[PDB]
């Protein structure tokens, strides 16, 4: 009985990981960067436009990142990659 | 002894959680938050904060004093007028 955490962006095709594969949120964003040729916009020091958002099992969207490591494993449901367009059909 | 509540920006794009026990005023948590939506709300602050009891109820932030909220506030929200 593992993770298996479905991780989905717009026009690519899903993917499931187990999260617990990583220890900490940067090898978890550096993995998923590199399966959606994404390398270098996930974890860059000055915050590239892309972000990543995940669903709780209280069914809300938040950043990744933000929660301990230790919690968020046991609270993410799935996980969702967003295009700087795609952050601001979302905003208002 | 850290305490992490959720924080909504009524039309932010997603949701955002802080450490309560990492901040000591009311005024030090509103100038940290307007710099998490920071690059929301560029493009001063109008926006009013609420939190919520233990008992499912929103009660405005700043009322009680600062020591206690970080124990009574479960979750945070940010109103527009």
């Known amino acids: 009985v593992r993770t298996y955490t479905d991780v989905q962006k717009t026009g690519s095709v899903g993917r499931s990981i187990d999260v617990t594969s990583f220890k900490d949120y940067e090898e978890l964003k550096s993995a998923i960067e590199s399966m959606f040729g994404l390398e270098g916009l996930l974890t860059h020091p000055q915050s590239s436009g892309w972000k990543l958002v995940y669903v709780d099992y209280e069914s809300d969207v938040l950043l990744v990142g933000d929660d301990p490591w230790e919690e968020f494993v046991g609270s993410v449901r799935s996980i969702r990659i967003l295009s700087p367009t795609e952050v601001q059909q979302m905003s208002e | ?81």
């Open chain 2, 1 to 81: 002894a850290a305490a992490f509540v959720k924080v909504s920006m009524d039309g932010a794009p997603y949701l955002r959680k802080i450490d309560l026990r990492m901040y000591k005023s009311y005024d030090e948590l509103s100038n940290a938050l307007s710099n998490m939506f920071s690059s929301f709300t560029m493009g001063s602050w109008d926006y009013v904060p609420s939190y919520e009891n233990k008992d499912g109820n929103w009660m405005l932030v700043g009322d009680v004093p600062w020591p206690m909220f970080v124990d009574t506030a479960k979750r945070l929200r940010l109103m527009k007028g």
